[PDB]
């Protein structure tokens, strides 16, 4: 047989764990049945016994094998003849795709592959929250059970655990609205488990018995309180009427649930966003705009809060990626307007020089190939499909340092791809744009920062209240989280990207009417005046209470 040493270890490298030196040890070897057939890791935390083999965490016993369905398996299970796949169904399919993607080169308990898993849960739940009569629900429920089995097995080993939002949070509810796509007059009800649900067909009874019970309103209150404490819950419900809470003044519809959402936000964080407007003293020069989205309801601490902050910063490219792209093409730098709005009581030279000698070096397409294969984060923004470039990226990276032949062979492929498309002008412009448009844009920005440090203009700030932060965060996430979204930022004003994010957060509702910039195009001077009208709208709203 084999001996066990100090969790524990076994040797003929196979770890073993008990939650420690009790009579639970008697239950352990009982389960164990064989010699070479042993999982790398094995655990005993509760009535559940769990193992980690390869990259996969499983829950083995409670004294049942659980495969998450593949996308095609799900296509077979959610199939409903005659019906088109709607956005809600697409959001799920995509989230499942992104998940199985992550278990390929990660352990299931890594935070990346858990955030993936959570989003799946988030997307399934909202599927059902918003489409209770869909012929899809059976398959969704089957998938949901699978996900929760996965979360349960895995969370034991997730290191932080903080990102995992309690099943009884206000967040865990609110998160479902995104993929629910619910009409706001729709009410929330509770089922025979007291879970949140909406009803369509068995509807009439619930519709008739509305004032009859407050279990729904009290569940929502209980949720807020479990997450934000009784003080927050007391305070924000104290100033929410019954008709704020529901069109008809009974229970809670979705409009109401959003008012609970926003209310929590104003409480935790009075300002929704800060708009920055750089007005250079003018070399016949260009003005700049950016927006910092606040933290709203979000409860994060330390490093993760700083990260969240940087990722909520709106410009012509997401900030973490801009930063790395800039280093990558050469190899700390701070690239926010907030960084230069300090005034005299407490890099941009090595980066400015390097970038000047890059654009002008680019202003003279074989060289291009070398740059994209260096920057794959940017190469995916060119519109060339992964399966085409990756062979070459791979060749460049690992295979023997035989670089220049590959760089040349890649350039050839780019032209075969431009022809295939049936619009080569367009393919070629897009590659060109990624490569060099980004360089020029980053350069011009760094130069504005410098111009501000050398006091050659003025950075204006507008602090905006009353907008839907979460909404703004999500919009900006759309606009920046895939390689295409980014190409779409690259080729427009920061001013307009900002205006799209403001509009997501409720801007127009605030101002009252639809705002149109002169000619229909955003500029920093347009954003500014917009900014100012939004501020005037808030006072003529908060002063109304």
Binding interface with Cl ion (CB under 5 A) = 288, 494
- Cβ at position 523, least distance to Cl ion in Å: 10
- Cβ at position 200, least distance to Cl ion in Å: 19
What are the residues whose beta carbons fall under 8 Å from the beta carbon of 535, sequence distance 6 or more?
462, 464
Structure tokens at 540: 């003529």
- Cβ at position 77, least distance to Cl ion in Å: 23
- Cβ at position 177, least distance to Cl ion in Å: 8
- Contacts by residues 506-513 (CB-CB < 8 Å, ≥ 24 positions apart): 506/466, 506/467, 506/468, 506/471, 507/467, 507/534, 510/466, 510/467, 510/534, 510/537, 510/538, 510/541, 511/537, 512/537
- Cβ at position 519, least distance to Cl ion in Å: 18
- Cβ at position 296, least distance to Cl ion in Å: 18
Name residue, tokens 């040890």.
25
What are the residues whose beta carbons fall under 8 Å from the beta carbon of 306, sequence distance 6 or more?
none
- Cβ at position 357, least distance to Cl ion in Å: 23
Query: Cα separation of 144 and 138, whole Å?
Result: 10
What angle (nearest 5°) sits at the alpha carbon of residue 411, between those of residues 407 and 415? 165
- Cβ at position 179, least distance to Cl ion in Å: 6
Residue 158 or 489 with smaller CB distance to Cl ion: 489
Residue 384 or 448 with smaller CB distance to Cl ion: 448
Helix (H) or strand (E) holding 138: helix 137-155
Residue 44 or 448 with smaller CB distance to Cl ion: 448
Query: Cα separation of 457 and 276, whole Å?
Result: 13
Residue 361 or 509 with smaller CB distance to Cl ion: 509
Residue 116 or 288 with smaller CB distance to Cl ion: 288
* Buried b or exposed e, range 3-36, using 16+ CB within 10 angstroms: eeeeeeebeeeeebbbeeeeeeeeebeeeeeeee
Residue 89 or 410 with smaller CB distance to Cl ion: 89
Nearest CA among 68, 71, 113 for reference residue 92: 71
Residue 288 or 486 with smaller CB distance to Cl ion: 288
Query: Cα separation of 368 and 351, whole Å?
Result: 20
Residue 464 or 494 with smaller CB distance to Cl ion: 494
CB 188 within 8 A of CB 484: no
Q: At what angle do helices 87-102 and 137-155 cross, to 10 degrees?
A: 30
3-state helix, strand, coil in the chain (%, to 5): 55, 10, 35
Residue 374 or 531 with smaller CB distance to Cl ion: 531
Helix (H) or strand (E) holding 195: none
Residue 52 or 288 with smaller CB distance to Cl ion: 288
Query: Cα separation of 193 and 20, whole Å?
Result: 35
- Cβ at position 87, least distance to Cl ion in Å: 6
- Cβ at position 88, least distance to Cl ion in Å: 8
Question: How many C-beta atoms lie closer than 10 Å to residue 522's C-beta?
Answer: 21
Query: Cα separation of 211 and 450, whole Å?
Result: 62
């Amino acid at each position: 047989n084999l001996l066990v040493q100090e969790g524990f270890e076994v040797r003929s490298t196979i770890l073993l764990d008990n939650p420690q030196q009790k009579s639970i040890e008697r239950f352990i070897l009982a389960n164990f049945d064989n010699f070479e057939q042993m999982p790398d890791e094995l655990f005993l935390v509760d009535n559940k016994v769990l193992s980690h083999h390869d990259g996969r965490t499983r829950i083995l016993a409670r004294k049942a094998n659980v495969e998450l369905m593949s996308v095609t398996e799900l296509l077979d299970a959610a199939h409903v003849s005659g019906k088109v796949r709607g956005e809600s169904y697409q959001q799920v399919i995509d989230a499942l795709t992104e998940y199985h993607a992550s278990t390929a080169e990660h352990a299931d308990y890594e935070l990346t592959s858990v955030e993936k898993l959570l989003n799946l849960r988030k997307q399934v739940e909202g599927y059902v929250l918003g489409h209770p009569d869909s012929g899809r629900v059976q398959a969704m429920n089957a998938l949901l059970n699978q996900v929760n089995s996965r979360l349960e097995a895995v969370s034991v080993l997730v290191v932080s655990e903080q990102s995992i939002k309690a099943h009884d949070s206000f967040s865990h509810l609110y998160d479902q609205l995104d993929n629910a796509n619910l009409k706001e007059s729709k009410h929330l009800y509770l089922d025979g488990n007291g879970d949140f649900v909406t009803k369509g067909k068995g509807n009439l009874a619930n519709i008739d018995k509305l004032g009859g019970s407050d279990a729904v309103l009290e569940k929502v209150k209980a949720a807020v309180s479990h997450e934000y404490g009784q003080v927050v819950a007391d305070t924000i419900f104290a100033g929410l009427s019954a008709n704020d809470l529901a069109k008809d003044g009974k229970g809670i519809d979705i409009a109401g649930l959003n008012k609970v959402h926003q209310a929590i936000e104003q409480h935790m964080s009075p300002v929704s966003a800060t708009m920055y407007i750089w007005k250079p003293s003018d070399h016949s020069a260009l003005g700049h705009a950016a927006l910092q989205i606040g933290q709203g309801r979000t409860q994060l601490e330390g490093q993760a809060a700083a990260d969240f902050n940087k990722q909520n910063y709106v410009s012509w490219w997401p900030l973490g990626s801009k930063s790395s792209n800039i280093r990558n093409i050469f190899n700390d730098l701070k690239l926010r307007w907030s960084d230069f709005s300090q005034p005299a009581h407490q890099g941009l030279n090595d980066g400015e020089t390097k970038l000047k000698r890059f654009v002008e070096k680019l202003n003279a397409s074989e060289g291009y190939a070398s740059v994209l294969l260096g920057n794959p984060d940017m190469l995916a923004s060119t519109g060339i499909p992964a399966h085409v470039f990756q062979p070459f990226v791979d060749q460049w990276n690992d295979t023997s340092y035989d670089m220049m032949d590959v760089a040349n062979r890649f350039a050839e492929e780019l032209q075969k791809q431009a022809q295939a498309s049936g619009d080569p002008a367009l393919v070629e412009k897009r590659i060109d744009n990624v490569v060099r448009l980004f360089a020029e844009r980053a350069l011009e920005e760094i130069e504005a920062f410098k111009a501000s440090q050398a006091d050659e203009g003025r950075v204006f700030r507008i602090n905006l209240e009353g907008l839907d932060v979460a909404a703004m965060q999500a919009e900006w996430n759309r606009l920046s989280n895939d390689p295409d979204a980014r190409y779409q930022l690259l080729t427009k004003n920061a001013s307009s990207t900002v205006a799209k994010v403001l509009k997501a957060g409720g801007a127009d509702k605030l101002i009252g009417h639809t705002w149109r910039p002169k000619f229909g195009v955003w500029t920093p001077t347009e954003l500014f005046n917009f900014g100012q009208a939004l501020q005037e709208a808030q006072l003529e709203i908060a002063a109304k209470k």
